[PDB]
């Protein structure tokens, strides 16, 4: 399965930094400043996509950024390959998440959520705890397990940790990489992650989600 399709390393060509769905100079309101958008699209994600394409060379021309993260998600000699092409993805994907003033659940979704943990309140007091205990650098993720009758689990990854090399199928991300919030929160990490919520893309979130589970 591919989360993202459409995410590739193009035949003779660099990988491109994917285009948001919203101007960054505009931040993304209520949550983000301009400054903190800038940082972590043009610099954080953009260093990861270059680096990216340095170290694939041609190797991997045509295959989508997942098939590169599965392929060297054990490999030794390409850590530093896998570190790039993960963070692409979980970037891509993160920044998918998120939308100026956030859209609504669609009822499908939320009433996964609920029948899953009860009540969204739940599953997002659950979420932010996972979050503000994933220790060190990382990534907070609901996901689709199919090897659990497609259960939505909420799952920690560290560093460029990326839960498709688990077999699961993520339809939410949060960055907790400190460099996520650092310029808006500073060390409020626990704030960060309260007040996202109000910026997340649900229907991204529940299409991912609709076809995670098809
Ligand atoms: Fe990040």
Known sequence: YATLP????????????????????DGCAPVFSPRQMELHYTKHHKAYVDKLNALAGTTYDGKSIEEIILAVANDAEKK???NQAAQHFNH????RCITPNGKAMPKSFESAVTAQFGSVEQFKDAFVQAGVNNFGSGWTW???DPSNKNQLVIDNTS????????GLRPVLAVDVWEHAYYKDFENRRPDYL??????????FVAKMHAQAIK
Not at 7 to 21: H, R, V
């Open 142 to 144: 609901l996901c689709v």
């Open 159 to 166: 560093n460029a940790g990326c839960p498709l090399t688990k």
């Open 6 to 25: 459409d995410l590739l390393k193009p035949s003779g060509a660099p990988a491109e930094l994917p285009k948001l769905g919203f101007n960054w100079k």
């Open 194 to 203: 309260k007040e996202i919520w109000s910026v997340i893309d649900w229907e």
């Open 80 to 82: 530093g390959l896998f």
């Open 92 to 95: 891509t994907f993160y920044f």
